[PDB]
Amino acid sequence: PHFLNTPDKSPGDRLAEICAKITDVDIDKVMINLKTEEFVLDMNTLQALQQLLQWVGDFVLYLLVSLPNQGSPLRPGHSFLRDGTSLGMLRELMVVIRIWGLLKPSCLPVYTATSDDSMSLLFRLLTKLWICCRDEGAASPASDGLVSRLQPKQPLRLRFGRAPTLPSSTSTLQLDGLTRAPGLHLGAYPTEECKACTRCGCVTMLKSPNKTTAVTQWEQRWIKNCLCGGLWRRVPLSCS
Amino acid sequence: QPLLDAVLANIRSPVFNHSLYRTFVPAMMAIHGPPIVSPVVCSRKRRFEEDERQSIPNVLQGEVARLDPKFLVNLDPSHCSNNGTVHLICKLDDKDLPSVPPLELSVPADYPAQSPMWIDRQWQYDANPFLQSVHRCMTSRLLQLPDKHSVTALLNTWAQSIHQACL
Amino acid sequence: DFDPVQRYKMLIPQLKESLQTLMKVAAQNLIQNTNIDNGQKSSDAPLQRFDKCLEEFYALCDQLELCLRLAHECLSQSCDSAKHSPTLVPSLPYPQYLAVIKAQITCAKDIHTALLDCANKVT
Amino acid sequence: NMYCIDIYCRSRGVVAIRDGAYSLFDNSKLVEGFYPAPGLKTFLNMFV
């Protein structure tokens, strides 16, 4: 909904939705195919770089490196990548952040090295599996070889926001009345918390003030319950 | 020479100590690969229950455990439980001649004082002339004791005065 | 033909200056990252890779360490040779020296076997 | 002092091997030192 576009013949929502029906590869061509002007909304756009850009980049890169992990200790391995619609949303995100980088130089780097940007081949292989994952289609072997090898731009250690388990149906429960024994989305996951770190349902545990300037959309969005995040806890800042 | 990192750490005022994560940990985990530098489980309860709750401050306990077996300390009427913590009712049961048990009520373990108080002395000492001389000698010795202590110093001085002033 | 002392002497200033340069570029990357994240974008300039810096630093460190270790090994070899053999080489007859070395090895092996049989008899 | 390798064990039995003359980016440059390209070490180890 960040489309604060000038009045046009149609709305930005339906236009970004129909952007899915686009060319095969080279998103640098898709951007000129649809539009490139009416996307800027603020000069102080430096909000998703330190928080979201690295996040979405790590997510898509893990989605890449997951392909050679077909023989994983799981029938679906780590994930499916059989929807395409979500991948279409990811493509909309990557093209709009390409426009952002064209406008605001605080774009999303490759996070390791050798940007020679580098998201081009990434988007290319995403679309290559897209034609294999749009609708009523099976997964391809050339894309396997294309994704198997890795460049000097492939980090690791992704968050994987999830909740700790509680499988005490009739089996086992290692707890008492007190003394929990120890064993994030907008980043802010250091080694030991040094802020409010408002605990939440599953993974958030985000800081209460967040030291924000204009990213108030997220904070004002997560004041109430969250997805598997109604369990807003007050876990103390027992840093160790 | 590289004070630049020092002034940068000085600059690091904002609470978001997570940018340095993305700044440093990629290359660190790349060139150094100990993802588990301590896979040993660490889950211990710091404070469950730890208290004596059944005796006096054990400082005086460890002190009185060292004294000679010729000193027999007992328990007086309950007026030195926790704060005063000491009712030095002692008997010099040994080969030497016996005498009147001392009082020697010291103070909290901080020790801004000593034991000798001598409450029951008023009639225990003036009645017997020899015991009166013993009391005189013990007072003269205690006054010459710079900052006497809880059990050792007081009882030692008392015994030596009792067995020196025989004459 | 470079010498271990010479290679050490020429590597130490390169190591120091590489340390200085990598620390400077690390500070530059840190202040740029903070300005882009904490404050507003002011450092409108591309930084460096920052990985090659400490990578080549560790490379030169490993090189220095292994060459100094080789020099130490050479000195230890010379010391043990002078202790276990007299300084004589083309003066001493080479076949006689080879036979003496073989006899020394056989004698050491015999002493080791004797101590091993002793330990076994202790068992 | 030539053709460095680097093996290291981290998991219960997992010991990874790499060529120490690449600097995490082979297409860019080299380590200005020990000679790279030890050869087909990958298949040599994959033998077992």
Side-chain angles (χ1 to χ4, degrees), chain B residues 53 55-69 71-74:
Chain B
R53 92 193 70 90
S55 278
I56 72 155
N58 43 20
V59 190
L60 260 51
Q61 293 187 5
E63 178 184 5
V64 74
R66 322 156 180 172
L67 277 296
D68 54 283
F71 290 174
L72 278 298
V73 194
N74 205 24

mmCIF file of all heavy atoms in Angstrom, chain B residues 52-74, unseen atoms left out:
data_model
loop_
_atom_site.group_PDB
_atom_site.id
_atom_site.type_symbol
_atom_site.label_atom_id
_atom_site.label_comp_id
_atom_site.label_asym_id
_atom_site.label_seq_id
_atom_site.Cartn_x
_atom_site.Cartn_y
_atom_site.Cartn_z
ATOM 1 N N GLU B 52 21.119 -20.965 56.224
ATOM 2 C CA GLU B 52 21.313 -21.725 57.453
ATOM 3 C C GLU B 52 20.000 -21.876 58.209
ATOM 4 O O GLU B 52 19.532 -22.993 58.451
ATOM 5 C CB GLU B 52 22.368 -21.044 58.328
ATOM 6 N N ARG B 53 19.408 -20.751 58.615
ATOM 7 C CA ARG B 53 18.083 -20.657 59.224
ATOM 8 C C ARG B 53 17.939 -21.496 60.491
ATOM 9 O O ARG B 53 16.835 -21.593 61.044
ATOM 10 C CB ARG B 53 16.977 -21.015 58.213
ATOM 11 C CG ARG B 53 16.548 -22.478 58.180
ATOM 12 C CD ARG B 53 15.698 -22.778 56.958
ATOM 13 N NE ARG B 53 16.478 -22.735 55.726
ATOM 14 C CZ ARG B 53 17.104 -23.784 55.200
ATOM 15 N NH1 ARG B 53 17.043 -24.965 55.802
ATOM 16 N NH2 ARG B 53 17.791 -23.653 54.074
ATOM 17 N N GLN B 54 19.032 -22.069 61.000
ATOM 18 C CA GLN B 54 18.936 -22.971 62.138
ATOM 19 C C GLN B 54 20.012 -22.735 63.191
ATOM 20 O O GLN B 54 20.139 -23.554 64.111
ATOM 21 C CB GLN B 54 18.992 -24.430 61.667
ATOM 22 N N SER B 55 20.785 -21.658 63.098
ATOM 23 C CA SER B 55 21.835 -21.401 64.075
ATOM 24 C C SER B 55 22.238 -19.934 64.000
ATOM 25 O O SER B 55 21.665 -19.146 63.243
ATOM 26 C CB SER B 55 23.037 -22.321 63.849
ATOM 27 O OG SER B 55 22.816 -23.594 64.431
ATOM 28 N N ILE B 56 23.240 -19.581 64.798
ATOM 29 C CA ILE B 56 23.769 -18.222 64.883
ATOM 30 C C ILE B 56 24.655 -17.966 63.670
ATOM 31 O O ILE B 56 24.879 -18.887 62.872
ATOM 32 C CB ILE B 56 24.550 -18.026 66.190
ATOM 33 C CG1 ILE B 56 25.869 -18.796 66.129
ATOM 34 C CG2 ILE B 56 23.728 -18.489 67.374
ATOM 35 C CD1 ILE B 56 26.943 -18.229 67.020
ATOM 36 N N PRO B 57 25.157 -16.736 63.470
ATOM 37 C CA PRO B 57 26.197 -16.528 62.453
ATOM 38 C C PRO B 57 27.357 -17.499 62.605
ATOM 39 O O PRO B 57 28.004 -17.547 63.656
ATOM 40 C CB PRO B 57 26.635 -15.082 62.702
ATOM 41 C CG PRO B 57 25.404 -14.418 63.202
ATOM 42 C CD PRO B 57 24.624 -15.456 63.972
ATOM 43 N N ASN B 58 27.625 -18.279 61.556
ATOM 44 C CA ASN B 58 28.623 -19.340 61.623
ATOM 45 C C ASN B 58 30.047 -18.819 61.744
ATOM 46 O O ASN B 58 30.969 -19.626 61.901
ATOM 47 C CB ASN B 58 28.509 -20.241 60.392
ATOM 48 C CG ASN B 58 28.326 -19.455 59.111
ATOM 49 O OD1 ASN B 58 28.644 -18.268 59.047
ATOM 50 N ND2 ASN B 58 27.807 -20.114 58.083
ATOM 51 N N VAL B 59 30.252 -17.505 61.663
ATOM 52 C CA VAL B 59 31.586 -16.946 61.862
ATOM 53 C C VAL B 59 32.090 -17.281 63.258
ATOM 54 O O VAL B 59 33.189 -17.825 63.436
ATOM 55 C CB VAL B 59 31.564 -15.428 61.618
ATOM 56 C CG1 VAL B 59 32.970 -14.874 61.583
ATOM 57 C CG2 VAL B 59 30.825 -15.119 60.331
ATOM 58 N N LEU B 60 31.282 -16.973 64.272
ATOM 59 C CA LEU B 60 31.659 -17.308 65.637
ATOM 60 C C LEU B 60 31.724 -18.817 65.835
ATOM 61 O O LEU B 60 32.479 -19.301 66.683
ATOM 62 C CB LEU B 60 30.683 -16.669 66.622
ATOM 63 C CG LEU B 60 31.179 -15.374 67.267
ATOM 64 C CD1 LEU B 60 31.665 -14.386 66.214
ATOM 65 C CD2 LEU B 60 30.084 -14.757 68.116
ATOM 66 N N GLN B 61 30.953 -19.575 65.055
ATOM 67 C CA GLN B 61 31.048 -21.031 65.118
ATOM 68 C C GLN B 61 32.432 -21.504 64.696
ATOM 69 O O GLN B 61 33.093 -22.268 65.414
ATOM 70 C CB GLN B 61 29.977 -21.664 64.232
ATOM 71 C CG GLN B 61 28.561 -21.436 64.704
ATOM 72 C CD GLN B 61 27.559 -22.229 63.897
ATOM 73 O OE1 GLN B 61 27.931 -23.026 63.036
ATOM 74 N NE2 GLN B 61 26.279 -22.020 64.173
ATOM 75 N N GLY B 62 32.882 -21.066 63.518
ATOM 76 C CA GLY B 62 34.210 -21.426 63.059
ATOM 77 C C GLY B 62 35.304 -20.906 63.967
ATOM 78 O O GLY B 62 36.372 -21.515 64.068
ATOM 79 N N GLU B 63 35.059 -19.780 64.641
ATOM 80 C CA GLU B 63 36.039 -19.289 65.604
ATOM 81 C C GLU B 63 36.118 -20.202 66.822
ATOM 82 O O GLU B 63 37.201 -20.669 67.190
ATOM 83 C CB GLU B 63 35.702 -17.863 66.033
ATOM 84 C CG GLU B 63 36.664 -17.311 67.073
ATOM 85 C CD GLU B 63 36.271 -15.934 67.565
ATOM 86 O OE1 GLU B 63 35.196 -15.445 67.162
ATOM 87 O OE2 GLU B 63 37.038 -15.340 68.354
ATOM 88 N N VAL B 64 34.975 -20.470 67.457
ATOM 89 C CA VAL B 64 34.953 -21.256 68.683
ATOM 90 C C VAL B 64 35.360 -22.700 68.438
ATOM 91 O O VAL B 64 35.779 -23.389 69.375
ATOM 92 C CB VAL B 64 33.558 -21.182 69.335
ATOM 93 C CG1 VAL B 64 32.559 -22.030 68.566
ATOM 94 C CG2 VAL B 64 33.622 -21.603 70.795
ATOM 95 N N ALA B 65 35.256 -23.185 67.198
ATOM 96 C CA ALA B 65 35.725 -24.536 66.912
ATOM 97 C C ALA B 65 37.232 -24.675 67.083
ATOM 98 O O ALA B 65 37.719 -25.793 67.286
ATOM 99 C CB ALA B 65 35.319 -24.946 65.498
ATOM 100 N N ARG B 66 37.978 -23.571 67.014
ATOM 101 C CA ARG B 66 39.431 -23.629 67.116
ATOM 102 C C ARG B 66 39.927 -23.626 68.554
ATOM 103 O O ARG B 66 41.053 -24.071 68.803
ATOM 104 C CB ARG B 66 40.066 -22.446 66.383
ATOM 105 C CG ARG B 66 39.389 -22.057 65.088
ATOM 106 C CD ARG B 66 39.689 -20.604 64.756
ATOM 107 N NE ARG B 66 39.049 -20.183 63.515
ATOM 108 C CZ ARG B 66 39.030 -18.931 63.072
ATOM 109 N NH1 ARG B 66 39.614 -17.967 63.771
ATOM 110 N NH2 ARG B 66 38.427 -18.644 61.928
ATOM 111 N N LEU B 67 39.129 -23.130 69.495
ATOM 112 C CA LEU B 67 39.606 -22.936 70.855
ATOM 113 C C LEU B 67 39.943 -24.271 71.513
ATOM 114 O O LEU B 67 39.525 -25.342 71.066
ATOM 115 C CB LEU B 67 38.568 -22.191 71.694
ATOM 116 C CG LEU B 67 38.519 -20.661 71.599
ATOM 117 C CD1 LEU B 67 39.810 -20.054 72.129
ATOM 118 C CD2 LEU B 67 38.228 -20.169 70.190
ATOM 119 N N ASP B 68 40.714 -24.187 72.594
ATOM 120 C CA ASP B 68 41.152 -25.377 73.303
ATOM 121 C C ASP B 68 39.954 -26.115 73.894
ATOM 122 O O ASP B 68 38.962 -25.493 74.287
ATOM 123 C CB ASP B 68 42.126 -25.003 74.414
ATOM 124 C CG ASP B 68 41.561 -23.955 75.348
ATOM 125 O OD1 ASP B 68 41.534 -22.768 74.961
ATOM 126 O OD2 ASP B 68 41.132 -24.316 76.462
ATOM 127 N N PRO B 69 40.020 -27.446 73.977
ATOM 128 C CA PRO B 69 38.909 -28.201 74.576
ATOM 129 C C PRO B 69 38.727 -27.935 76.058
ATOM 130 O O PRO B 69 37.711 -28.359 76.622
ATOM 131 C CB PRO B 69 39.294 -29.663 74.316
ATOM 132 C CG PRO B 69 40.778 -29.637 74.187
ATOM 133 C CD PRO B 69 41.111 -28.328 73.532
ATOM 134 N N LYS B 70 39.675 -27.256 76.705
ATOM 135 C CA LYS B 70 39.519 -26.908 78.110
ATOM 136 C C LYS B 70 38.487 -25.812 78.332
ATOM 137 O O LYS B 70 38.137 -25.542 79.485
ATOM 138 C CB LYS B 70 40.863 -26.483 78.699
ATOM 139 N N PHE B 71 37.995 -25.178 77.271
ATOM 140 C CA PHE B 71 36.951 -24.169 77.374
ATOM 141 C C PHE B 71 35.621 -24.790 76.969
ATOM 142 O O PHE B 71 35.484 -25.302 75.853
ATOM 143 C CB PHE B 71 37.262 -22.961 76.490
ATOM 144 C CG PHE B 71 38.409 -22.126 76.983
ATOM 145 C CD1 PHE B 71 38.883 -21.069 76.228
ATOM 146 C CD2 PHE B 71 39.010 -22.394 78.199
ATOM 147 C CE1 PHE B 71 39.937 -20.299 76.675
ATOM 148 C CE2 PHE B 71 40.064 -21.627 78.650
ATOM 149 C CZ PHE B 71 40.527 -20.577 77.887
ATOM 150 N N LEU B 72 34.646 -24.747 77.874
ATOM 151 C CA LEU B 72 33.341 -25.367 77.653
ATOM 152 C C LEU B 72 32.293 -24.265 77.586
ATOM 153 O O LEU B 72 31.940 -23.680 78.613
ATOM 154 C CB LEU B 72 33.013 -26.365 78.764
ATOM 155 C CG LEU B 72 33.589 -27.783 78.676
ATOM 156 C CD1 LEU B 72 33.080 -28.494 77.437
ATOM 157 C CD2 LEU B 72 35.112 -27.792 78.718
ATOM 158 N N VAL B 73 31.794 -23.984 76.386
ATOM 159 C CA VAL B 73 30.833 -22.907 76.169
ATOM 160 C C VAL B 73 29.434 -23.499 76.081
ATOM 161 O O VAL B 73 29.231 -24.563 75.482
ATOM 162 C CB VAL B 73 31.175 -22.106 74.900
ATOM 163 C CG1 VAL B 73 30.389 -20.807 74.868
ATOM 164 C CG2 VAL B 73 32.667 -21.835 74.835
ATOM 165 N N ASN B 74 28.465 -22.807 76.673
ATOM 166 C CA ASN B 74 27.086 -23.269 76.749
ATOM 167 C C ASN B 74 26.148 -22.186 76.211
ATOM 168 O O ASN B 74 26.582 -21.189 75.625
ATOM 169 C CB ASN B 74 26.735 -23.658 78.186
ATOM 170 C CG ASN B 74 25.610 -24.671 78.259
ATOM 171 O OD1 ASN B 74 25.370 -25.418 77.311
ATOM 172 N ND2 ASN B 74 24.910 -24.698 79.387
#
